[PDB]
Design an enzyme around this catalytic site. Structure first.
Site, PDB file in Angstrom:
ATOM      1  N   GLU B  66     -24.370   7.834 -30.513  1.00  0.00           N
ATOM      2  CA  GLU B  66     -24.232   9.476 -29.956  1.00  0.00           C
ATOM      3  C   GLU B  66     -22.923   9.612 -30.481  1.00  0.00           C
ATOM      4  O   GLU B  66     -22.618  10.944 -31.385  1.00  0.00           O
ATOM      5  CB  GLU B  66     -23.996  10.258 -28.851  1.00  0.00           C
ATOM      6  CG  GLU B  66     -23.788  11.756 -28.717  1.00  0.00           C
ATOM      7  CD  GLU B  66     -23.946  12.323 -27.287  1.00  0.00           C
ATOM      8  OE1 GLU B  66     -25.035  11.414 -26.676  1.00  0.00           O
ATOM      9  OE2 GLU B  66     -23.952  13.868 -27.064  1.00  0.00           O
ATOM     10  N   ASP B  86     -27.707   5.586 -26.949  1.00  0.00           N
ATOM     11  CA  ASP B  86     -27.639   7.143 -25.673  1.00  0.00           C
ATOM     12  C   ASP B  86     -26.625   6.627 -24.554  1.00  0.00           C
ATOM     13  O   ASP B  86     -27.925   6.481 -24.010  1.00  0.00           O
ATOM     14  CB  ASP B  86     -28.545   8.260 -25.874  1.00  0.00           C
ATOM     15  CG  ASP B  86     -28.195   9.462 -25.111  1.00  0.00           C
ATOM     16  OD1 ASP B  86     -26.733  10.121 -25.111  1.00  0.00           O
ATOM     17  OD2 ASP B  86     -28.946  10.467 -24.823  1.00  0.00           O
ATOM     18  N   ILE B  88     -25.055   7.504 -23.116  1.00  0.00           N
ATOM     19  CA  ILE B  88     -25.251   8.475 -20.840  1.00  0.00           C
ATOM     20  C   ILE B  88     -25.780   9.323 -21.724  1.00  0.00           C
ATOM     21  O   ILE B  88     -24.729  10.249 -21.662  1.00  0.00           O
ATOM     22  CB  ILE B  88     -23.709   8.515 -20.328  1.00  0.00           C
ATOM     23  CG1 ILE B  88     -23.108   7.033 -20.200  1.00  0.00           C
ATOM     24  CG2 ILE B  88     -23.594   8.744 -19.215  1.00  0.00           C
ATOM     25  CD1 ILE B  88     -21.190   7.568 -19.229  1.00  0.00           C
ATOM     26  N   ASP B  89     -27.468   9.367 -20.852  1.00  0.00           N
ATOM     27  CA  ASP B  89     -28.384  10.505 -21.399  1.00  0.00           C
ATOM     28  C   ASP B  89     -27.978  11.341 -19.648  1.00  0.00           C
ATOM     29  O   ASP B  89     -28.000  10.491 -18.717  1.00  0.00           O
ATOM     30  CB  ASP B  89     -29.736  10.655 -21.831  1.00  0.00           C
ATOM     31  CG  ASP B  89     -30.315  11.486 -21.751  1.00  0.00           C
ATOM     32  OD1 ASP B  89     -29.880  11.804 -22.617  1.00  0.00           O
ATOM     33  OD2 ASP B  89     -31.113  11.689 -21.393  1.00  0.00           O
ATOM     34  N   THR B  91     -24.110  13.027 -19.444  1.00  0.00           N
ATOM     35  CA  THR B  91     -22.527  13.704 -18.800  1.00  0.00           C
ATOM     36  C   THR B  91     -23.187  14.000 -18.370  1.00  0.00           C
ATOM     37  O   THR B  91     -21.803  14.235 -17.205  1.00  0.00           O
ATOM     38  CB  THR B  91     -22.924  13.423 -20.643  1.00  0.00           C
ATOM     39  OG1 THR B  91     -23.154  12.842 -20.951  1.00  0.00           O
ATOM     40  CG2 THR B  91     -21.238  13.358 -20.500  1.00  0.00           C
ATOM     41  N   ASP B 216     -31.639  10.654 -28.225  1.00  0.00           N
ATOM     42  CA  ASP B 216     -31.738  11.765 -26.663  1.00  0.00           C
ATOM     43  C   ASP B 216     -33.137  11.080 -26.046  1.00  0.00           C
ATOM     44  O   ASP B 216     -33.506  10.665 -25.420  1.00  0.00           O
ATOM     45  CB  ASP B 216     -31.574  13.406 -26.441  1.00  0.00           C
ATOM     46  CG  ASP B 216     -30.335  13.209 -26.600  1.00  0.00           C
ATOM     47  OD1 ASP B 216     -29.432  12.896 -26.073  1.00  0.00           O
ATOM     48  OD2 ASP B 216     -29.636  14.314 -27.205  1.00  0.00           O
TER      49      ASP B 216
HETATM   50  O1  LIG Z   1     -25.610  14.989 -23.915  1.00  0.00           O
HETATM   51  P1  LIG Z   1     -26.397  14.332 -23.160  1.00  0.00           P
HETATM   52  O2  LIG Z   1     -26.214  14.066 -22.007  1.00  0.00           O
HETATM   53  O3  LIG Z   1     -26.279  12.620 -23.613  1.00  0.00           O
HETATM   54  O4  LIG Z   1     -27.603  15.080 -23.740  1.00  0.00           O
HETATM   55  C1  LIG Z   1     -28.778  15.976 -23.507  1.00  0.00           C
HETATM   56  C2  LIG Z   1     -29.261  16.285 -21.825  1.00  0.00           C
HETATM   57  O5  LIG Z   1     -30.631  15.104 -22.452  1.00  0.00           O
HETATM   58  C3  LIG Z   1     -29.651  17.117 -21.650  1.00  0.00           C
HETATM   59  O6  LIG Z   1     -30.668  17.048 -20.645  1.00  0.00           O
HETATM   60  C4  LIG Z   1     -30.626  18.055 -22.901  1.00  0.00           C
HETATM   61  O7  LIG Z   1     -31.292  19.113 -22.611  1.00  0.00           O
HETATM   62  C5  LIG Z   1     -29.128  18.296 -24.360  1.00  0.00           C
HETATM   63  O8  LIG Z   1     -30.316  18.818 -24.743  1.00  0.00           O
HETATM   64  C6  LIG Z   1     -28.935  16.918 -24.179  1.00  0.00           C
HETATM   65  O9  LIG Z   1     -28.328  16.824 -25.492  1.00  0.00           O
HETATM   66 CA   LIG Z   2     -24.717  11.200 -24.586  1.00  0.00          CA
HETATM   67 CA   LIG Z   3     -28.116  12.808 -24.067  1.00  0.00          CA
HETATM   68 CA   LIG Z   4     -23.683  15.154 -25.995  1.00  0.00          CA
END
Ligand SMILES: O=P([O-])([O-])O[C@@H]1[C@H](O)[C@H](O)[C@@H](O)[C@H](O)[C@H]1O
Ligand SMILES: [Ca+2]
Ligand SMILES: [Ca+2]
Ligand SMILES: [Ca+2]
Ligand SMILES: O=P([O-])([O-])O[C@@H]1[C@H](O)[C@H](O)[C@@H](O)[C@H](O)[C@H]1O
Ligand SMILES: [Ca+2]
Ligand SMILES: [Ca+2]
Ligand SMILES: [Ca+2]
Ligand SMILES: [Cl-]
Ligand SMILES: [Cl-]
Lengths: 272, 272
Positions: B66, B86, B88-89, B91, B216
């Site tokens: 990412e 990813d 940190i999924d 953030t 993701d």
């Molecule tokens: O930005 P991130 O926190 O790594 O990833 C997000 C999370 O997974 C979120 O739950 C989802 O609804 C967003 O579409 C993603 O972009």
């Molecule tokens: Ca992320």
């Molecule tokens: Ca993510």
């Molecule tokens: Ca993001």
């Protein structure tokens, strides 16, 4: 009251293991007022267990329970020590094995909540709070966030138990207004008590919802306030245990900003 | 590939440690494409650490990260062993201390996912899955629910990263259609990887969303399928890791029904 509170905790952890054991097995799902308004034998069993064990140690105290109300009881609050119980907050989650179900107990004397005990059994988190004594989660003292800027807040709320097009559209409309302010995001864990307990820990900045009952916020409300937060009606007016509406925020600034954005849905009070 | 997988699980736990340590400290919250599209120094460092540790043992492998893509790298998938990461999924949850953050790692060969590793550090849950070997969470085999009746299902989804009125209205309207079918409820924990993992365990019957990126869901997708689930495109067609759309369900019966109800939201593919 410490005697009662310590007793409530033992009782909560006890009812907690019953629930958390039942969640592992196949359930017989039954409907109440609609195909999405669920109840199981555990909801009922646990509530009868709690009431009995309480009236056995405190026979003069009154009780207000979700299933008892559905059994025929009236949810009327007097100045008499009253136990406001929700055997399983998150029945739908329970039925689906979604990791968030809690046992909620609130105790009111003179129509005011003295202590609240909320047990999230799946994760083993016992949230407690006593008036003027502080809020804790497994012995860890809680403190709400300091966020005063709405555009940097994380909110929690639920879509409700109603499937009426109008009611639903209004809920979504309220969700839209706040979402586009904007705020960082909105979460829905599936239980009013836990949502509020997350506000108390500071992981969420505020919680708001219309359609809840006294047994949903009786235990967690005191936990939010003892953690340093504030309770308020969706209208900006003072919190009302029987109003079916509530805003549990970290501070008065967010609470009123949220109140300013949402439109009230007409609900029937629990004391009617 | 098992060697790579074993090394991955190790790297994920190590990264999980870092993330869960930083979550309790003071952080510098920066912005990416907007005030609600966040990134922290931890997102950046964890990714750099992961890619470096991997590049050491397997110098001939490709990476899609990412933050690397944000830094200029292009998200183009080839047949070469690629690590889709990813750091940190979740953030926004990280920044708020909301109890759900995951480190996701997906490994693809010939453009197909061979294995996936998703670590929810706060909960200490390690979800893993190798193609044809099964999906596990902390050494326990996972299995999706068997609900084939949409009116008795619990769905999980998110509101997205966009605040554009037009888009937010499509998201909420798609949500309205599903909710009023009706379904038992809809939840949002705040992270796509975890949402999909909850589906793999059976706690939720289906997950859907338009707006996510390959990183993701590259890790969590193989976990759902290995758990007996299915990945689908909102059109009802086959899943396309680069399309920004996904439906991860327990079975095709529910998946097809969701695809039927929701409306497509125009988005830029990851390969565009
Ligand atoms: O930005 P991130 O926190 O790594 O990833 C997000 C999370 O997974 C979120 O739950 C989802 O609804 C967003 O579409 C993603 O972009
Ligand atoms: Ca992320
Ligand atoms: Ca993510
Ligand atoms: Ca993001
Ligand atoms: O029915 P119950 O599961 O005890 O309680 C429900 C939960 O608190 C839910 O999160 C809330 O949105 C509903 O209004 C409540 O009725
Ligand atoms: Ca109920
Ligand atoms: Ca209940
Ligand atoms: Ca309840
Ligand atoms: Cl978010
Ligand atoms: Cl819901």
């Amino acid at each position: 009251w410490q005697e009662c509170m310590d007793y409530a905790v033992t009782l909560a952890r006890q009812a907690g293991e019953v629930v958390c054991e039942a969640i592992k097995n196949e359930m017989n799902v039954m409907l109440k007022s609609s195909p999405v308004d669920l109840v199981t034998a555990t909801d009922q069993k646990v509530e009868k267990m709690l009431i009995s064990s309480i009236k056995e140690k405190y026979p003069s105290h009154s009780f207000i329970g979700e299933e008892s109300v559905a059994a025929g009881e009236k949810s009327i609050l007097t100045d008499n020590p009253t136990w406001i119980i929700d055997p399983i907050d998150g029945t739908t989650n329970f039925v689906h094995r979604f990791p968030f179900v809690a046992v909620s107990i609130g105790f009111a004397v003179n129509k005011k909540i003295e202590f609240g005990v909320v047990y999230s059994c799946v994760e083993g988190k016992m949230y407690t709070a006593r008036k003027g004594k502080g809020a804790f989660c497994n012995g860890q003292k809680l403190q709400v966030s300091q966020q005063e800027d709405i555009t940097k807040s994380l909110l929690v709320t639920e879509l409700g138990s109603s499937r009426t097009p109008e009611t639903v559209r209004m809920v979504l409309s309220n969700m839209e207004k706040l979402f586009c302010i904007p705020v960082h995001g909105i979460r829905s864990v599936g239980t009013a008590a836990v949502n509020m307990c997350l506000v108390a820990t500071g992981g969420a900045d505020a919680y708001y919802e219309m359609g809840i009952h006294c047994w949903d916020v009786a235990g967690a409300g005191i936990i939010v306030t003892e953690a340093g937060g504030v309770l308020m009606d969706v209208t900006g007016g003072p919190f009302d245990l029987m109003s079916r509406r509530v805003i549990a925020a970290n501070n008065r600034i967010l609470a009123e900003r949220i109140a300013k954005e949402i439109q009230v849905i007409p609900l029937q009070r629990d004391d009617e």
